[PDB]
Design a protein around this motif. Structure first.
Motif, PDB file in Angstrom:
ATOM      1  N   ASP A  66       9.217   7.046  10.954  1.00  0.00           N
ATOM      2  CA  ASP A  66      10.634   7.310  10.715  1.00  0.00           C
ATOM      3  C   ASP A  66      11.418   7.284  12.016  1.00  0.00           C
ATOM      4  N   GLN A  67      10.948   7.663  12.905  1.00  0.00           N
ATOM      5  CA  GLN A  67      11.526   7.725  14.245  1.00  0.00           C
ATOM      6  C   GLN A  67      11.643   6.332  14.855  1.00  0.00           C
ATOM      7  N   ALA A  68      10.638   5.590  14.750  1.00  0.00           N
ATOM      8  CA  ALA A  68      10.754   4.211  15.213  1.00  0.00           C
ATOM      9  C   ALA A  68      11.852   3.471  14.460  1.00  0.00           C
ATOM     10  N   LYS A  69      11.911   3.659  13.141  1.00  0.00           N
ATOM     11  CA  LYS A  69      12.951   3.011  12.351  1.00  0.00           C
ATOM     12  C   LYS A  69      14.347   3.449  12.791  1.00  0.00           C
ATOM     13  N   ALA A  70      14.529   4.739  13.086  1.00  0.00           N
ATOM     14  CA  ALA A  70      15.834   5.209  13.551  1.00  0.00           C
ATOM     15  C   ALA A  70      16.216   4.532  14.856  1.00  0.00           C
ATOM     16  N   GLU A  71      15.252   4.401  15.774  1.00  0.00           N
ATOM     17  CA  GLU A  71      15.507   3.702  17.029  1.00  0.00           C
ATOM     18  C   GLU A  71      15.833   2.238  16.788  1.00  0.00           C
ATOM     19  N   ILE A  72      15.115   1.604  15.856  1.00  0.00           N
ATOM     20  CA  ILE A  72      15.350   0.200  15.551  1.00  0.00           C
ATOM     21  C   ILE A  72      16.761   0.009  15.021  1.00  0.00           C
ATOM     22  N   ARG A  73      17.200   0.892  14.110  1.00  0.00           N
ATOM     23  CA  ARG A  73      18.563   0.791  13.580  1.00  0.00           C
ATOM     24  C   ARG A  73      19.591   0.898  14.695  1.00  0.00           C
ATOM     25  N   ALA A  74      19.388   1.841  15.615  1.00  0.00           N
ATOM     26  CA  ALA A  74      20.379   2.042  16.665  1.00  0.00           C
ATOM     27  C   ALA A  74      20.520   0.799  17.524  1.00  0.00           C
ATOM     28  N   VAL A  75      19.426   0.056  17.708  1.00  0.00           N
ATOM     29  CA  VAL A  75      19.442  -1.167  18.509  1.00  0.00           C
ATOM     30  C   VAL A  75      19.945  -2.357  17.690  1.00  0.00           C
ATOM     31  N   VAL A  76      19.478  -2.487  16.453  1.00  0.00           N
ATOM     32  CA  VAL A  76      19.693  -3.725  15.705  1.00  0.00           C
ATOM     33  C   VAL A  76      21.012  -3.727  14.931  1.00  0.00           C
ATOM     34  N   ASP A  77      21.499  -2.562  14.509  1.00  0.00           N
ATOM     35  CA  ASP A  77      22.780  -2.506  13.799  1.00  0.00           C
ATOM     36  C   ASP A  77      23.922  -3.169  14.568  1.00  0.00           C
ATOM     37  N   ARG A 114       6.448  -3.123  21.872  1.00  0.00           N
ATOM     38  CA  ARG A 114       5.059  -2.703  21.736  1.00  0.00           C
ATOM     39  C   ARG A 114       4.976  -1.279  21.202  1.00  0.00           C
ATOM     40  N   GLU A 115       5.856  -0.392  21.685  1.00  0.00           N
ATOM     41  CA  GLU A 115       5.876   0.977  21.182  1.00  0.00           C
ATOM     42  C   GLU A 115       6.221   1.007  19.697  1.00  0.00           C
ATOM     43  N   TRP A 116       7.213   0.222  19.287  1.00  0.00           N
ATOM     44  CA  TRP A 116       7.584   0.189  17.876  1.00  0.00           C
ATOM     45  C   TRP A 116       6.423  -0.279  16.997  1.00  0.00           C
ATOM     46  N   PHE A 117       5.743  -1.365  17.380  1.00  0.00           N
ATOM     47  CA  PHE A 117       4.694  -1.818  16.462  1.00  0.00           C
ATOM     48  C   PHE A 117       3.531  -0.843  16.441  1.00  0.00           C
ATOM     49  N   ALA A 118       3.292  -0.113  17.539  1.00  0.00           N
ATOM     50  CA  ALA A 118       2.210   0.867  17.507  1.00  0.00           C
ATOM     51  C   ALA A 118       2.547   2.023  16.573  1.00  0.00           C
ATOM     52  N   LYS A 119       3.787   2.524  16.632  1.00  0.00           N
ATOM     53  CA  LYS A 119       4.172   3.589  15.710  1.00  0.00           C
ATOM     54  C   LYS A 119       4.210   3.102  14.264  1.00  0.00           C
ATOM     55  N   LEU A 120       4.746   1.899  14.017  1.00  0.00           N
ATOM     56  CA  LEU A 120       4.764   1.408  12.637  1.00  0.00           C
ATOM     57  C   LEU A 120       3.344   1.201  12.118  1.00  0.00           C
ATOM     58  N   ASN A 121       2.445   0.750  12.994  1.00  0.00           N
ATOM     59  CA  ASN A 121       1.046   0.576  12.615  1.00  0.00           C
ATOM     60  C   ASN A 121       0.475   1.889  12.086  1.00  0.00           C
ATOM     61  N   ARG A 122       0.582   2.955  12.878  1.00  0.00           N
ATOM     62  CA  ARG A 122      -0.024   4.221  12.482  1.00  0.00           C
ATOM     63  C   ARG A 122       0.616   4.771  11.217  1.00  0.00           C
ATOM     64  N   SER A 123       1.934   4.584  11.059  1.00  0.00           N
ATOM     65  CA  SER A 123       2.588   5.048   9.839  1.00  0.00           C
ATOM     66  C   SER A 123       2.135   4.244   8.626  1.00  0.00           C
ATOM     67  N   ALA A 124       2.127   2.914   8.739  1.00  0.00           N
ATOM     68  CA  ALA A 124       1.816   2.077   7.589  1.00  0.00           C
ATOM     69  C   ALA A 124       0.342   2.119   7.219  1.00  0.00           C
ATOM     70  N   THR A 177       0.860  -1.191   0.000  1.00  0.00           N
ATOM     71  CA  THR A 177       0.000   0.000   0.000  1.00  0.00           C
ATOM     72  C   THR A 177       0.892   1.235   0.000  1.00  0.00           C
ATOM     73  N   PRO A 178       0.400   2.375  -0.508  1.00  0.00           N
ATOM     74  CA  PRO A 178       1.255   3.581  -0.531  1.00  0.00           C
ATOM     75  C   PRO A 178       1.852   3.952   0.827  1.00  0.00           C
ATOM     76  N   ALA A 179       1.044   3.960   1.895  1.00  0.00           N
ATOM     77  CA  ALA A 179       1.567   4.297   3.218  1.00  0.00           C
ATOM     78  C   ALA A 179       2.499   3.214   3.730  1.00  0.00           C
ATOM     79  N   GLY A 180       2.226   1.956   3.396  1.00  0.00           N
ATOM     80  CA  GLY A 180       3.154   0.904   3.773  1.00  0.00           C
ATOM     81  C   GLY A 180       4.492   1.042   3.074  1.00  0.00           C
ATOM     82  N   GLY A 181       4.474   1.435   1.799  1.00  0.00           N
ATOM     83  CA  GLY A 181       5.731   1.644   1.087  1.00  0.00           C
ATOM     84  C   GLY A 181       6.518   2.810   1.648  1.00  0.00           C
ATOM     85  N   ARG A 182       5.826   3.912   1.957  1.00  0.00           N
ATOM     86  CA  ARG A 182       6.484   5.035   2.615  1.00  0.00           C
ATOM     87  C   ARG A 182       7.113   4.597   3.934  1.00  0.00           C
ATOM     88  N   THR A 183       6.491   3.635   4.621  1.00  0.00           N
ATOM     89  CA  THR A 183       6.972   3.210   5.925  1.00  0.00           C
ATOM     90  C   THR A 183       8.126   2.215   5.804  1.00  0.00           C
TER      91      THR A 183
END
Ligand code: HEM
Ligand SMILES: COc1cccc(OC)c1O
Length: 402
Positions: free
Chosen positions: A185-196, A154-164, A63-69
């Motif tokens: 975008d913010q959740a993704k930045a946090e995810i990178r900092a943890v997962v990288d 839980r916070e990450w999936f809630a933010k990704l939900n609303r974005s997607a 979906t367009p919003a999913g692709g943006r996310t």
């Protein structure tokens, strides 16, 4: 389409708060219909959803919003060789024989740990205190994210939900709420900092975590999949794979509470829990309208001649209330005759984690009913459901004696 001019006045908030009235009209008036505020054709009936999801003339599109996310290559949004590789990447830990080796030792101690925090309180809000924690802690440990707290997952999936699901578009097809992607975008930045750093470590020191296997499996010696190639599928997991088992548990509980006599049956006979969950997923589908396909040649669906390149949103949550299939589908009914449902989708892009997800929900409900056999819902509180893309109850207040 002139006779559907009323669709011009359907709002995003209406679809988020309760899409079922609009979609009941869609299933009767236009099983394939262009919904202006979503900027897309939507498939609302079981026949049309199944046809589009399995058609040789359609392929996956995000979906367009999913692709943006998520960007590229999200497993849900790609096809051909890349999709074949991403499926081969995620499938090993999800194979039924493999899940059966360790799923009990994974989920049962997690369920007990979260239950031990409240099982003597006499009150709980089960979405935040139980359903979401068990769902995210189970998957998080499987993925190799043991050190990411369940609050954070839980916070990450809630933010990704609303974005997607930030799907509303204006007259010109442009996103009406462009600021709604910022917390994604913010959740993704946090995810990178943890997962990288975890990926840094797994590249040099592989282990039994799923993400380590995503880097290494099937690769020539000394090579790993590039992290940019796997991150979009990590995000797919950190939204729906983290969120949906918790929502499926919770919707099943809300449905059972609505039929007290059936709640009693299931507590008395936990072998009915799989049937209870299957009806829960049909009754309020956790993935309600979050995926899509795109035609690859001109094709006629539900009497609509679509050109090549036409996206179609698959509103499986509506298809699972198709009155061509079900009698009184808005009612939860444990004793509904078992029929096929579309809560896991269909076709080559159907859910890859069905067996795992069903076990997570089953074990969680088994332990809940063993710990609190006199569970009741707190009828002083209302249960509100929210979401058009992903749908579930926002809270589930319960009470029990002692
Ligand atoms: C009750 C919980 C779940 C439900 C209701 C659910 C439902 C779905 C649905 C409707 C789709 C899209 C299918 C389509 O477009 O035809 C999907 C895709 C997917 N799901 Fe599940 N899901 C659940 C849990 C999980 C879990 C826990 C995982 C991973 C451990 C998972 C992995 C995937 C993957 C990888 C895809 C993408 C498949 C592809 O595009 O090739 N799901 N899921
Ligand atoms: C739009 O996002 C999604 C759609 C379908 C499945 C997902 O996770 C499994 C997911 O994260």
């Amino acid at each position: 389409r002139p006779d559907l001019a009323w669709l011009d006045e359907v709002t995003m908030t209406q679809l988020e708060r309760n899409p079922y009235e609009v979609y009941e009209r869609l299933r009767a008036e236009a099983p394939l219909a262009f919904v202006p505020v979503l900027g897309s054709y939507v498939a609302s009936t079981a026949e049309v959803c199944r046809e589009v999801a399995t058609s040789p003339d359609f392929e996956a599109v995000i979906t367009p919003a999913g692709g943006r996310t998520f960007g590229h290559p999200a497993i849900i949004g790609v096809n051909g060789d890349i999709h074949a590789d991403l499926r081969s990447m995620v499938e090993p830990a999800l194979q039924p024989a493999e899940v059966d080796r360790w799923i009990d030792d994974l989920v049962r101690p997690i369920a007990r740990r979260y239950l031990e925090r409240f099982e003597n309180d006499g009150h709980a809000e089960l979405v935040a205190q139980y359903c979401e924690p068990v769902s995210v802690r189970s998957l998080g440990d499987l993925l190799g994210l043991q050190e990411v707290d369940s609050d954070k997952l839980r916070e990450w999936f809630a933010k990704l939900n609303r974005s997607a699901t930030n799907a509303a578009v204006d007259e010109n097809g442009e996103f009406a709420n462009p600021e709604g992607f910022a917390e994604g975008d913010q959740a993704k930045a946090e995810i990178r900092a943890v997962v990288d750093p975890l990926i840094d470590k797994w590249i040099e020191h592989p282990d039994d975590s799923a993400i380590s296997h995503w880097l290494h499996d099937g690769m020539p010696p000394g090579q790993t999949r590039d992290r940019e190639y796997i991150y979009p599928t990590i995000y797919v997991y950190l939204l729906g794979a983290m969120q949906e088992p918790g929502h499926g548990m919770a919707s099943t509980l809300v449905g059972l509470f609505s039929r007290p006599e059936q709640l009693e049956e299931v507590v008395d006979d936990p072998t009915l829990i799989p049937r209870a969950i299957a009806e829960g997923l049909r009754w309020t589908s956790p993935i309600w309208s979050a995926t899509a396909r795109i035609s690859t040649k001109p094709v006629t669906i539900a009497g609509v001649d679509l050109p090549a390149g036409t996206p179609v949103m698959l509103s499986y949550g509506s298809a699972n209330h198709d009155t061509g299939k079900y009698e009184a589908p808005s009612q939860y009914d444990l004793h509904r005759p078992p029929l096929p449902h579309l809560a896991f989708g269909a076709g080559n892009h159907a859910c890859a984690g069905i067996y795992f997800a069903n076990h997570v929900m089953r074990i969680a409900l088994e332990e809940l009913f063993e710990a609190i056999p006199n569970l009741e819902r707190d009828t002083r509180e209302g249960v509100e459901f929210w979401g058009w893309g992903f749908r579930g109850p926002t809270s589930l207040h319960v009470t029990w004696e002692v």
